[PDB]
Point group: none
Chain length 108, copies 4
Amino acid sequence: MAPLRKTYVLKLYVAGNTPNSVRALKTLNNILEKEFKGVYALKVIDVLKNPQLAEEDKILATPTLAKVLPPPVRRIIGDLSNREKVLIGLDLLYEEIGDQAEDDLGLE
Amino acid sequence: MAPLRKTYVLKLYVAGNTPNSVRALKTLNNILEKEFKGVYALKVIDVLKNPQLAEEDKILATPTLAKVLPPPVRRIIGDLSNREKVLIGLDLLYEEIG
Amino acid sequence: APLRKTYVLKLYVAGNTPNSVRALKTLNNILEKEFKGVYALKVIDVLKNPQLAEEDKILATPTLAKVLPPPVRRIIGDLSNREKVLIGLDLLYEEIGDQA
Amino acid sequence: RKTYVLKLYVAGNTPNSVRALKTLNNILEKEFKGVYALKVIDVLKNPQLAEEDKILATPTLAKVLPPPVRRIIGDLSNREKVLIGLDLLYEEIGDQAEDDLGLE
């Protein structure tokens, strides 16, 4: 809980959220805090819940920026695009990325 | 006032298709056809029908590019974003013909 | 007028040379003629200043080059294949200085 | 079993340069044998980054490295000014072996 918290956030932009991609997203979320504790941070943006992009938000084609990502990570990114058919694209920015989101209804 | 050479391709990336949404895309296109003869061309992309971007594709925030665009075009783009919420983002290409 | 914000095309070159500097000029020229206020060129000579800023990162050329204007793509190509002085690039939404 | 490849992107080599890159090539294979690998790349030698290559601001990664390695890096950056930036991969090196135990 230091003063700053700037890290190379890996933003994923998805259309929808099918229970399976949500698993994999949770999966990939640990492959990161695990092998790269501190270096990266996942951040998913569902366009269906948030269509309008914020000035700083940019969506690049998965294929391009993927190759510079960790091996196990690239594999998830691959299922997501070619299988779970939900990954629109992604980006890599050194941003704030603080508190978790997803307006909680208590999700149980 | 001349149809020839380099063309701006305005790529709108949409999520959804409300009744108004369709109306305006007909207008924007009509505007670009009758006013920006050639100069500008439109190309709407349905991320629902197909989400994965090709290799040469990218979506940039609307507020950004729409700023430099011609008033009559920013208008329809502003509405497609903050009123119909179908407009995710967009890109600007400078090709020739397709 | 008081500045503005746009997408910056940061090229990272290992030093400079007449040709590379020419093309780097041709290129900059282009973005200010065809892609006004959408893309801004910003060259970073790793030879002059080696250190890297915080949000400053460098991705290989072929990765992020596909998504650029064709002409930007040609020049980027030559600064990388012909002059072989380009390390990589990046595309950030920033706040271009009134100059620097 | 894999290893943290600590790729270092440097701008040329100085006298006080190879100094720490010889002290870093040590501390690692020593206290952290097999743990944190290391491969130095002088851009000036070969600029063009490969499709899977990237360079990141030294303040970012280094800060998640052993307090000591951060010293050689830290010095190597502000003082000897040659460290353009660094990258940290977590993959497996299968180029050479010494002894292993696969289970058929």
